[PDB]
Amino acid sequence: SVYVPDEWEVSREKITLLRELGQGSFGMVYEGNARDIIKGEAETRVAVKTVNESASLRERIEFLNEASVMKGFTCHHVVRLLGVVSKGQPTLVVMELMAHGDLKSYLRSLRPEAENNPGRPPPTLQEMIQMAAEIADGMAYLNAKKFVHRDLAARNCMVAHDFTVKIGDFGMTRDIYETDYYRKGGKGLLPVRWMAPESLKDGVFTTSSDMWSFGVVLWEITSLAEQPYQGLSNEQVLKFVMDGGYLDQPDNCPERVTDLMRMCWQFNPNMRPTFLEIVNLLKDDLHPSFPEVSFFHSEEN
Ligand SMILES: O=C1N=Nc2nnc(-c3c(-c4ccccc4)nn4ccccc34)cc21
């Protein structure tokens, strides 16, 4: 419980909170305007995440330390941390704004019956491949930095103003999608419907179990984010998957996407593909901008 201010610290005076976006599991997230936060931009539309005002000083420290995990990361397909306001109150962290929010909420809005349907039809095959490659590229970047995500899921991806999908601001959906988590004392909140068998069995998270979860994200894309194993309880899901079960393809699932899921859900984790291998499989079928922005095509890879 210490937070030392660094080069990410920004003056509170630069940040204006404009409207609520939604409740993060630790506090309200707002849309804001930030002055002189990005070099070359006089002003930037941002998201800014806070703690609940009921939070202790130590909880604010823990919040900032958890948020700071993202400081090292620079990838087009991972949501970017822009600044921190730790001095005074309220505690703020300023993030790249993702205009269409989290991918689970977004996908659900595309259901024909949804009250908030934006008029956009469900994703085409080309759109799904594009999303898959973007998610896999962000994940490849993170895994290359020896970072294991542990909670890859549509709710933890975000959708930008230009409809690019990115790995979302980390750990932001435990309130809006609380039912996606099974609390198991000692282990904390477990996203059991997204977890690999060895993670369920042994509490082990690896890049190979991130790949398992990627398979489930593809399933959510093709099902418009139904609950995986709907109508099994959390304890039933945990046993089902440990015993070798995995998700059946949604109705009308495109074959190419089905095949990706099947690779992700191999029982032996050493047999699953890597994220770079996923991007390699998809590379010839993407927007022209992809090689300009991807980790996969970068000298860093
Ligand atoms: O934590 C974020 N970092 N960048 C973001 N961009 N957007 C949102 C966001 C969220 C949101 C996502 C997760 C938790 C809380 C709020 N909802 N939303 C609705 C419309 C437009 C944007 C958004 C959240 C973040």
CATH topology of the largest domain: Transferase(Phosphotransferase), domain 1
Across the major sheet, the strand order is: 1-2-3-5-4
Range of strand content: 15-25%
User: Bound compounds, please?
Assistant: ligand IR1
CATH class term of the largest domain: Mainly Alpha
Number of helices: 9
Q: Mind telling me the CATH superfamily name of the largest domain? A: Transferase(Phosphotransferase) domain 1
Q: How many domain regions? A: 2
Q: State the end-to-end CA separation.
A: 35 Å
Strand/helix succession: EEEHEEHHEEEEHHHHHH
Largest sheet: 5 strands, antiparallel
Protein name: Insulin receptor subunit beta
Domain Protein kinase: 15-290
Active site: 151
Cytoplasmic side: 1-301
Describe the structure.
Residues 1-301 are cytoplasmic. The modification S-nitrosocysteine is found at residue 75. This is Insulin receptor subunit beta. This protein is of the alpha+beta class and 301 residues long. It is built from 9 helices and 9 strands. A 5-stranded antiparallel sheet has the order 1-2-3-5-4, with no helix packed on it. Helix 3 runs antiparallel to helix 5, helix 3 runs antiparallel to helix 8 (275-282) and helix 5 runs antiparallel to helix 7. The protein binds the ligand O=C1N=Nc2nnc(-c3c(-c4ccccc4)nn4ccccc34)cc21.
